[PDB]
Amino acid sequence: XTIVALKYPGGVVMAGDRRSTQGNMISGRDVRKVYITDDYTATGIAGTAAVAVEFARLYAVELEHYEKLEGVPLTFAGKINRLAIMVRGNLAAAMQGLLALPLLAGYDIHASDPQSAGRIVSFDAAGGWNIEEEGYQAVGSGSLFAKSSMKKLYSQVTDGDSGLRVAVEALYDAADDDSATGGPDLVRGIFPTAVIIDADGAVDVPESRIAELARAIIESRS
Amino acid sequence: XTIVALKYPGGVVMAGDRRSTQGNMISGRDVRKVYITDDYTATGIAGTAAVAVEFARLYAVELEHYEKLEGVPLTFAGKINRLAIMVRGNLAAAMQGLLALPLLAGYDIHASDPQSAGRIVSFDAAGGWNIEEEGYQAVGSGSLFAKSSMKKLYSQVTDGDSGLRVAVEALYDAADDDSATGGPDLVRGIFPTAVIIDADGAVDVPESRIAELARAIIESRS
Amino acid sequence: XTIVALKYPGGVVMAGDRRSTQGNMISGRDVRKVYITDDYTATGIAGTAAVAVEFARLYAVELEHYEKLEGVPLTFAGKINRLAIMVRGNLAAAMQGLLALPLLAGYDIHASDPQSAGRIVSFDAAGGWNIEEEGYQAVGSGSLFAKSSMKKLYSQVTDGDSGLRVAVEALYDAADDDSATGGPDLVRGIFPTAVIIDADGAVDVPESRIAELARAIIESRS
Amino acid sequence: XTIVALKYPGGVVMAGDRRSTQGNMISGRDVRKVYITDDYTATGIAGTAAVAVEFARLYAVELEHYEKLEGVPLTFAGKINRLAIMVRGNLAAAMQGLLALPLLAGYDIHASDPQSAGRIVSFDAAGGWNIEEEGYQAVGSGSLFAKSSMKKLYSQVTDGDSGLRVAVEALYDAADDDSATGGPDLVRGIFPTAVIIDADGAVDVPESRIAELARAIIESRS
Amino acid sequence: XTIVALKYPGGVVMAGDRRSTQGNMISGRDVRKVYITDDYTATGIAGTAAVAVEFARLYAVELEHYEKLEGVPLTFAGKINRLAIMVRGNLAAAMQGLLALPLLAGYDIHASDPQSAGRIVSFDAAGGWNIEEEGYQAVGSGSLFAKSSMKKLYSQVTDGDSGLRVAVEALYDAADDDSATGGPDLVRGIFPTAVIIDADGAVDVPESRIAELARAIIESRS
Amino acid sequence: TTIVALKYPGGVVMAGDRRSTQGNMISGRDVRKVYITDDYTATGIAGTAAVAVEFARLYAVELEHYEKLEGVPLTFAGKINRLAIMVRGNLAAAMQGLLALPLLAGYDIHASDPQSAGRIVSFDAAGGWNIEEEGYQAVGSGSLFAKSSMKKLYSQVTDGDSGLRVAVEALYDAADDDSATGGPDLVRGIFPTAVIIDADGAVDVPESRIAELARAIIESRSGA
Amino acid sequence: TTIVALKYPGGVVMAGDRRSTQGNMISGRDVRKVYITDDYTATGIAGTAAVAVEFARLYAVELEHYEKLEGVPLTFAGKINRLAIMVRGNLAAAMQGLLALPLLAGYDIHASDPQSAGRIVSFDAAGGWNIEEEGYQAVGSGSLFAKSSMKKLYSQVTDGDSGLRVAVEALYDAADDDSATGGPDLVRGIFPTAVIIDADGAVDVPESRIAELARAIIESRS
Amino acid sequence: XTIVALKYPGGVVMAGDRRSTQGNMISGRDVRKVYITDDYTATGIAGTAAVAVEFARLYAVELEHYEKLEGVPLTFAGKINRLAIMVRGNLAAAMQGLLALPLLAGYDIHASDPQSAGRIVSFDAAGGWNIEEEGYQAVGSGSLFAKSSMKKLYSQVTDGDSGLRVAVEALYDAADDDSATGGPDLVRGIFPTAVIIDADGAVDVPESRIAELARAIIESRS
Amino acid sequence: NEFDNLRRGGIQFADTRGYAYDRRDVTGRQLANVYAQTLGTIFTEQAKPYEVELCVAEVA
Amino acid sequence: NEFDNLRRGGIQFADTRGYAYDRRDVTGRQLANVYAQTLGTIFTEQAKPYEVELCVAEVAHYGETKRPELYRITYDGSIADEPHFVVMGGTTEPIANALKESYAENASLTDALRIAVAALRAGSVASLEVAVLDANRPRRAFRRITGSALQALL
């Protein structure tokens, strides 16, 4: 599985593949790994459909819990801390094999510069966080391939459209070199999911828009 | 990786995928696993890119060696015994992790009935052989998926064309469910390899034909 | 053992074998692994013959407990969550060898489209769930054979009768290729059990109507 | 040690051997393994002289305990559940080597058909139960031999007397092929014990009647 | 070490050796292993000296405690159950090397027949108890030898004097074949200890009477 | 990972590299390991790079919590004792592989001589502390290279500027001999981070300054 | 360590880094890992430390040895086979930690098409070889990064110059993401080594040309 | 590292070296290991600094705490008991490798003879104490060398000046034969620390007096 | 709020008893009894007695 | 301090139930029930009863059709189901009567706000706290009507 995230001028985009494996066997082809967690954030977890939907569900509950109790949303630093705590609280279960590494994408509505208000935060085994200053990041079994792809393609990111294209291509490159990451299935019509976040909030990118970009990448390579 | 073999009236067909993997990484895309070993036989080994050529190369030398020394080819029974000895001689190395399981397809030119002269022989870890009386067989990580696909499609096998199609489809179905087996790559133009053997000998099925049959299974499922 | 479940237009059907094995030895021929858990759901458990009744009995108690307390049934999403919690609470005991993976079939009375209101949910070791979009699913030692059978036969499913047939055929195929799954015993008169769920509720399919389908599959393959 | 149980028209019969071993050494020759637990049930445990009585004694107390507190006896299903709980509560101790597998025989006074009201229930390591539809069952080190004997002799069961004979013969066969099961000792006058349960309740079969049957099995095979 | 116990008409007799060993070395010659625990019972313990010596003491306290609290002594069955619980409560410590196996001898004052009111009960590692109908029993490293001796000589037991003589001979035989059991030391004047229990209660057999018997057994074999 | 600290006349300077690795692979290029923990202290943590921000955050809270409650800052020795207990309370988790060794730099307001008021304290696995009396110290996988560099360079430290420059050079030298320590990246514009503490308190040295320093070292050593 | 090799029209180019490491410590900055082995070949070894100079030396002796004895060079396939035998003869030492995986670049003077006569062959642990049809390959700790860089840059290869440029950039990318691979040291004036092979033979690329390419790549990324 | 202590007429002197090692690497040159714990005692710890640093501070707090609470200081025996208790408490942590063995030097103000009122107490792993009658003692990696030095030099101890000389010479001898013990460093001016205790209390010996002694020892051996 | 508390506790009791023994083993007499013991305890020990009156009914 | 305590406990309750079952398993009836039980226990167990009066309201889910539910929970734990309006605090009767008359079932937002403000006035601008449970929002129905929007509304 591979999850990518990148900053574009005015926002951030996060995308993830749809595969699930039980060793060598493909156990799922429709898995959703990227979820909108509140109006300005999205989390992607490299793993099973449930440990991705249950982690995102709990974090979403935690964030909205604070908002209702206090009247205002948590600060982005606050959102990071809460996620870090959740991951750290799963360290005892991560020594068995139940590892879940999240990637957080968000837009800081309180940032000075709206152009660079997109945020990408990655977490390690211990529950340690790092706010990425390089522009892009990826987690999962195909992350090295996706990061190396974005390294060559990032200069082409100028807006939301080009950013989403680079994200989909990175995920394509991940699936091309990693069997645990699923590429776009033109036969069944299953494509990577994506979330785009700007000053107007977090929006699920429609399947049709990704399908158009997938076909363009395929047609560009043959 | 997956290798399939099936008997059709008047012959036998053997086909294999092109994928290679290290862990989840795809390390090979063009791998040839099926080789013509003599005028009437072919071997398919599901392992490394070279564990297929090197095993086949030695076996081909052994068969030809006998023919030049005695002036006649070995009996089909003799060909099986020689391959069984080669596999048994690699038992000490198969305990380390260097397991090589060959699948042999052939046409017994000395058989009574030319219709059922096709032969499929499988080998186990110990160097034990079994002549297949079920009409089809498969080896490798995607073998169970391929055998279960052929189980439902074998009745459509009445000749060489329908036999090859079923084989390609079985390989497709294996790739569909096993990430270690590679499906037909329409972008790069890489397709499974196949060998067809009848009374006229062993021949390498041209890419053009496996390609046409791959696009038809695709176009049909979509 | 093998349990299968598939969606048909207007409902869902779940069926399971009757075998129990202690190693090679057959310890049970009459085992029942599928139970109606409430008016619109049924669970089949793979792991132990004794466990399936106990897991189903507790889950049935949990579901009716809520219905009595709050006066309305849990939503289908709620039913999933409670089952996921039960499975997660058995993670400590699953490390010893007492693994029990359930498969849930149900009809969502609150769904928009009554034709596609059938639901199939599978669970992994960790207690993670996945609502199936592909139409069918299976769990147990013969699940791969059953899923591969259903892959070729699913297009023939159109009503409750054809669905139950494919389900029984999938189970037949599972028992044909897996010694731990029991095929229909015509001598003792023991057949797989099944449950069918539609807008009128969950009903146990009569033994006699499964026997009719088993006789049919057997004569169709002779 | 071996314990057998079988259904006859109008009731059920349970019988067990008298041996006890410490490795190869015969440590007991007079061991009672089958005990009447209430008016309509009897339990036989595969093991020692005491780790059988202790299980029976506790179970007996529990059933009576309920009858006095509630004024009515537990249902047969309730009696099963209580025994299942007792066995499950000994899972931690069964990992050491203190494994106790009980076999329950009873007559359901609340059953529709008095002819088939006899009940046989077996338990596995985990505390899982299975109500037997097959007519007979056995537990212990000679259980396979006894079940194979009953398979051939069960058709001769038409009443209480014939059912008791088959039980004693099954135990004879168990002792003939398993050194841990004790055959009838004509020298010391020690014979297997048995309990017969019908609509009139559970009654210990007199030693003299079992001796008569043991004499007759021995003369029939000489 | 070895402890023996046998029934005679009108009572029971228990006797034990005086040896103690630390590996090969002889650590004690005066050890008493048989203790009167109440008016009608006596226990002999074989195993580690530390748990055994303490063991008689704790048991004596439990029996007496019940008697003062309730006004009447415990039934013989009750006395057994209490000893069984004490032994079971020492199972965790028995896995280390602190194994203590007791042998209980008693006279049931509430028995129908005063001639056969003697009782011998043995315990296994698990805390399981057995009552000996054979009339003799032994525990310890020399038990097999003592039991075999008793089997040959039990016929000669007609009263308390002959019963005691057999008990001493069995212990003589145990010491003759087992180096961990001490024979009668005529040089130091140390002999096995013994307790005899009849309708008049439990009384320590005096040293001079045992010496007279030991000398006669020695004269008889020389 | 390498973190250096040195005393200069009137204060102390602490600097750390930005690299993170997973095995051979470079997992991060912008990790910050040096943090101001109160008005007069800074902590640098080596290893478990993601966690460096977290350890500093808890220590900072403890110091401030005391200061607000009691109305006065803890003594420097008190500050040391608190940090030693935090480290000691993490011995169980360090046996697994989650090891975090801190380096503490501070200025003692209460010290008699202002010029020698700067402090450097290092901690070992067990939670044991040591107040450095030799003028410099370093922790992390490149610490030996950094300490050996400073041993030849320290004599030229006479003020805050030259102290910062010896620290950057020490870090540079460490990156030179240790692959787990990242040197200044002129291509991406990422440089080591630093904190300087004197009588006026703890201040983050601007990226601008560490940058001009690194370029003066790197560009000249190279053809530039 | 990272070694790269790529085909350009009319030849092949191979390049390698200069780093050596002991755990995290850098133990070498001037390691030559790419050596001309005969007039039309070059081997690069991602092997413990300097073994490469011993290895390349032995292979060169072997190639030259055949040449003097037979008066003609070995065929490229023959060259490959000899190298495969050398690697296979080192499997016993590779289990300890002394792994040495070579990459072979060559120009087949006997090939039909001079434009595609460049050859790249990689070897696995077992001594298995694979000819690269994809155009490029890399071995060592930074191979994935280098291959992912070349995937995006390979289309820019049109001649000897542009081929050397892409090889140097691939090695730059490898060093950028892998600490065990050394980037170009402008301070000490140490740069990656390279060999270029065409119809005129194998030639060492001068340090100065690699230096200009390195500075141009550095300048291009700032 | 090494710590020495010796009785001189009217007092006790304790001295320790300044080295700290991490394997072979010198990690500290100015470590102080001897601390005044109350008006009449001093402790020197060898082993783990983290354990060592803590022990002195805590012990001092303990002695003073008692004094303030009760108005009088603890007896010398009590002081020993408290130290011994602290050491035992640390035993669980000593099995890991956190071993800290203290050496206690004191002056018993309540002793009969003021000339022999000096006290030296050593502790072992278990927390066991011993008061030296021989006049000197040492702990640490160089203790044997130091004790053997003092064995030959103790006859020269006539007062506090000569006892401090012998103490510093013993430490010199320890460093000469043990690389883990630091000798006096003339270049850095770092010398062993010492504490001298008499009827006037415990006092830190000034660095300058120790330095004069070291030079004398050095001049005496050149 | 008081009788709903009691309603919930009864459902809690009934479901646990049925699970522990058998469904056929849960009766109105048993439930009435659990309520009497519970009401009795509240009346006796709680600050305020429950202002409730309960009916438990059972059919065949 | 007393009703904010209750507000927090309700959110605590709601979020826990929704996570243990599912979002569509939390209702106004459930929350009113739990407030009744809490206020009832406080009235009886605690030294001083809570000087509060609570209203729990529920609207239908998006695209679903159900009439709004309004619950009044009083200091003693008494719970009443109101079908049209709830008035709490201060002098309730003049406000309750001004509403019972100037009532408009299915009224507009602008109309219902005016009908309400006036009643509040009978009992006794930015001197108001206004909010709605907007049945038309996808999930979170609660929306505050503040400042300029509130001003625009008037």
From Swiss-Prot, chains A, B, C, D, E, H:
One of its GO terms (cellular component) is proteasome core complex, beta-subunit complex. It is found in: Cytoplasm. Keywords: Autocatalytic cleavage, Cytoplasm, Hydrolase, Protease, Proteasome, Threonine protease, Virulence, Zymogen. The formation of the proteasomal ATPase ARC-20S proteasome complex, likely via the docking of the C-termini of ARC into the intersubunit pockets in the alpha-rings, may trigger opening of the gate for substrate entry. Interconversion between the open-gate and close-gate conformations leads to a dynamic regulation of the 20S proteasome proteolysis activity. Coiled coil: none annotated. It comes from the Bacteria. Its EC number is 3.4.25.1. It is an enzyme of class 3 (hydrolase). GO terms for molecular function: threonine-type endopeptidase activity. Pathway: Protein degradation; proteasomal Pup-dependent pathway. Its main location: cytoplasm. GO terms for biological process: modification-dependent protein catabolic process; proteasomal protein catabolic process. It catalyses: Cleavage of peptide bonds with very broad specificity. The 20S proteasome core is composed of 14 alpha and 14 beta subunits that assemble into four stacked heptameric rings, resulting in a barrel-shaped structure. The two inner rings, each composed of seven catalytic beta subunits, are sandwiched by two outer rings, each composed of seven alpha subunits. The catalytic chamber with the active sites is on the inside of the barrel. Has a gated structure, the ends of the cylinder being occluded by the N-termini of the alpha-subunits. Is capped by the proteasome-associated ATPase, ARC. Belongs to the peptidase T1B family. Component of the proteasome core, a large protease complex with broad specificity involved in protein degradation. This is Proteasome subunit beta. It comes from Mycobacterium tuberculosis (strain CDC 1551 / Oshkosh). The gene is prcB.
Swiss-Prot record, chain I:
Belongs to the peptidase T1A family. The modification Phosphothreonine is found at T16. This is Proteasome subunit alpha. Component of the proteasome core, a large protease complex with broad specificity involved in protein degradation. The M.tuberculosis proteasome is able to cleave oligopeptides not only after hydrophobic but also after basic, acidic and small neutral residues. In complex with the ATPase Mpa, degrades protein targets conjugated to a prokaryotic ubiquitin-like protein (Pup). Among the identified substrates of the M.tuberculosis proteasome are the pupylated FabD, PanB and Mpa proteins. Disruption phenotype: Cells lacking the core proteasome prcBA subunits exhibit reduced growth and persistence in mice. They are also attenuated in interferon-gamma-deficient mice. They also display increased sensitivity to reactive nitrogen intermediates (RNI) and increased resistance to oxidative stress. Was identified as a high-confidence drug target. It is found in: Cytoplasm. It comes from Mycobacterium tuberculosis (strain ATCC 25618 / H37Rv). The 20S proteasome core is composed of 14 alpha and 14 beta subunits that assemble into four stacked heptameric rings, resulting in a barrel-shaped structure. The two inner rings, each composed of seven catalytic beta subunits, are sandwiched by two outer rings, each composed of seven alpha subunits. The catalytic chamber with the active sites is on the inside of the barrel. Has a gated structure, the ends of the cylinder being occluded by the N-termini of the alpha-subunits. Is capped by the proteasome-associated ATPase, ARC (Mpa). In the course of search for new antibiotics, a class of oxathiazol-2-one compounds has been identified that selectively inhibits the M.tuberculosis proteasome over the human proteasome and that kills non-replicating M.tuberculosis. Phosphorylation enhances proteolytic activity of the proteasome.
